[PDB]
Design an enzyme around this catalytic site. Structure first.
Site, PDB file in Angstrom:
ATOM      1  N   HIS A 176      -9.432  -2.293  -5.044  1.00  0.00           N
ATOM      2  CA  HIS A 176      -8.308  -2.524  -4.150  1.00  0.00           C
ATOM      3  C   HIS A 176      -7.255  -3.401  -4.813  1.00  0.00           C
ATOM      4  O   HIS A 176      -6.057  -3.196  -4.610  1.00  0.00           O
ATOM      5  CB  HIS A 176      -8.739  -3.180  -2.835  1.00  0.00           C
ATOM      6  CG  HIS A 176      -7.623  -3.268  -1.841  1.00  0.00           C
ATOM      7  ND1 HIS A 176      -7.206  -2.185  -1.101  1.00  0.00           N
ATOM      8  CD2 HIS A 176      -6.763  -4.274  -1.553  1.00  0.00           C
ATOM      9  CE1 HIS A 176      -6.134  -2.515  -0.404  1.00  0.00           C
ATOM     10  NE2 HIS A 176      -5.844  -3.777  -0.661  1.00  0.00           N
ATOM     11  N   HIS A 197       0.787  -1.230   0.000  1.00  0.00           N
ATOM     12  CA  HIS A 197       0.000   0.000   0.000  1.00  0.00           C
ATOM     13  C   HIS A 197       0.821   1.283   0.000  1.00  0.00           C
ATOM     14  O   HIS A 197       0.516   2.208  -0.750  1.00  0.00           O
ATOM     15  CB  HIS A 197      -0.985  -0.014   1.174  1.00  0.00           C
ATOM     16  CG  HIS A 197      -1.920  -1.186   1.152  1.00  0.00           C
ATOM     17  ND1 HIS A 197      -2.723  -1.521   2.221  1.00  0.00           N
ATOM     18  CD2 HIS A 197      -2.164  -2.111   0.194  1.00  0.00           C
ATOM     19  CE1 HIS A 197      -3.421  -2.604   1.922  1.00  0.00           C
ATOM     20  NE2 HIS A 197      -3.100  -2.982   0.699  1.00  0.00           N
ATOM     21  N   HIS A 250      -0.732 -10.894  -5.162  1.00  0.00           N
ATOM     22  CA  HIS A 250       0.665 -10.510  -4.966  1.00  0.00           C
ATOM     23  C   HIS A 250       1.654 -11.506  -5.569  1.00  0.00           C
ATOM     24  O   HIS A 250       2.650 -11.107  -6.157  1.00  0.00           O
ATOM     25  CB  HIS A 250       0.967 -10.328  -3.474  1.00  0.00           C
ATOM     26  CG  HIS A 250       0.197  -9.216  -2.839  1.00  0.00           C
ATOM     27  ND1 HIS A 250       0.236  -7.920  -3.309  1.00  0.00           N
ATOM     28  CD2 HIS A 250      -0.651  -9.208  -1.782  1.00  0.00           C
ATOM     29  CE1 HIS A 250      -0.557  -7.162  -2.571  1.00  0.00           C
ATOM     30  NE2 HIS A 250      -1.107  -7.920  -1.638  1.00  0.00           N
TER      31      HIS A 250
HETATM   32  C1  LIG Z   1     -12.700 -10.940  12.207  1.00  0.00           C
HETATM   33  C2  LIG Z   1     -11.631  -9.881  12.042  1.00  0.00           C
HETATM   34  C3  LIG Z   1     -11.065  -9.883  10.637  1.00  0.00           C
HETATM   35  C4  LIG Z   1      -9.746 -10.625  10.559  1.00  0.00           C
HETATM   36  C5  LIG Z   1      -8.957 -10.169   9.358  1.00  0.00           C
HETATM   37  C6  LIG Z   1      -7.925 -11.189   8.928  1.00  0.00           C
HETATM   38  C7  LIG Z   1      -6.633 -10.519   8.494  1.00  0.00           C
HETATM   39  C8  LIG Z   1      -6.745  -9.907   7.110  1.00  0.00           C
HETATM   40  C9  LIG Z   1      -5.887 -10.633   6.102  1.00  0.00           C
HETATM   41  C10 LIG Z   1      -5.407  -9.697   5.018  1.00  0.00           C
HETATM   42  C11 LIG Z   1      -6.007 -10.052   3.675  1.00  0.00           C
HETATM   43  C12 LIG Z   1      -5.240  -9.408   2.541  1.00  0.00           C
HETATM   44  C13 LIG Z   1      -4.359 -10.419   1.838  1.00  0.00           C
HETATM   45  C14 LIG Z   1      -3.453  -9.763   0.771  1.00  0.00           C
HETATM   46  O1  LIG Z   1      -2.567  -8.932   1.157  1.00  0.00           O
HETATM   47  O2  LIG Z   1      -3.631 -10.097  -0.441  1.00  0.00           O
HETATM   48 ZN   LIG Z   2      -1.856  -7.248   0.103  1.00  0.00          ZN
HETATM   49 ZN   LIG Z   3      -3.805  -4.507  -0.528  1.00  0.00          ZN
END
Ligand SMILES: CCCCCCCCCCCCCC(=O)O
Ligand SMILES: [Zn+2]
Ligand SMILES: [Zn+2]
Ligand SMILES: [Zn+2]
Ligand SMILES: [Zn+2]
EC number: 3.5.1.108
Length: 267
Positions: A225, A73, A252
């Protein structure tokens, strides 16, 4: 365009989405020809593909025993504003996730741009190229301007959606938040990640529901996103990129795979 840095030091802080730890950033101005690099515990880690060490649930960089998680980001915002020379000092092990988008980074840096005395040396895609992986695909081809289209095919209510970014429409993607589906949370937690995730920094979606009470910022916020992510990963090429990209279900891992192939072709 001329190279750019920041007028003065900029700082940001907050929890890391994966480590769940507090971290802080200090963005330092740098002279012409320096490039974008991170600094942690005395080690400089260039924002280049050669330093990628993990891509499964974020884009992580590392060098000489020092690692920094989730750079996608902050790098995307720097790419979009064409900031070419800065040192991102990181006191912690991951870039703060903030609200899950690039908004805060974007607003702060955009107001502190400093043009420098050198023409930007853009990375220009010279010929078409395609990388694939388990049904996922990304295509890149020549273009005088950065154009990125992401097409998703989701198993939930989102279905098939598509979004195209073109220069000048930066604000349409810097507000799009990172997202996750409820069925992948168990895995993420199991592999030691997502420790700082919450509904405040992550858009959590179910087969037919949106858990965040605020809902989606856009009906296609998820694909916006993903475009935002790709632009961040593309900056790992070492300089602002000029090319037309089409990503079908990319992530990614596939983004970095493309970056490495484009770099090899010294394109
Ligand atoms: C219940 C609370 C929500 C828990 C969130 C889990 C952590 C988020 C994971 C990140 C997802 C993005 C993956 C990526 O960078 O492609
Ligand atoms: Zn990511
Ligand atoms: Zn992202
Ligand atoms: Zn110029
Ligand atoms: Zn995994």
């Amino acid at each position: 365009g001329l190279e750019k840095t920041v007028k003065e030091k900029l700082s940001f802080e907050g929890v890391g989405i994966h480590t769940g730890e507090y971290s802080k950033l200090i963005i330092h101005p740098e002279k012409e020809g320096t490039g974008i690099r991170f600094f942690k515990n005395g080690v400089y880690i260039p924002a280049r593909h050669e330093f990628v060490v993990h891509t499964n649930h974020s884009t992580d960089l590392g060098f000489k025993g020092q690692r920094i998680k989730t750079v996608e980001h902050i790098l995307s915002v720097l790419h979009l504003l064409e900031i070419t020379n800065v040192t991102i000092e990181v006191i912690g092990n991951e870039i703060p996730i903030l609200d899950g988008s690039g908004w805060e980074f974007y607003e702060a840096i955009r107001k502190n741009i400093l043009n420098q005395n050198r023409e930007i040396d853009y990375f220009v895609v010279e010929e078409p190229i395609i990388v694939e992986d388990e049904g996922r695909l990304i295509k890149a081809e020549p273009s005088d301007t950065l154009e990125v289209t992401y097409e998703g095919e989701f198993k939930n209510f989102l279905g098939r959606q598509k979004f195209t970014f073109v220069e000048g429409n930066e604000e349409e993607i810097v507000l799009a938040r990172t997202f996750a589906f409820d069925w992948e949370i168990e895995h993420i937690k199991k592999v030691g990640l997502g420790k700082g995730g919450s509904l405040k920094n992550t858009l959590v979606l179910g087969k037919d529901k949106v858990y965040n009470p605020e809902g989606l910022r856009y009906e296609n916020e998820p694909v916006r996103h993903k475009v935002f992510d790709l632009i961040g990963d593309l900056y790992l090429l070492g300089s602002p990129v000029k090319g037309k990209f089409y990503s079908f279900r990319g992530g990614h891992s596939l983004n970095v795979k493309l970056v490495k192939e484009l770099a090899k072709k010294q394109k």
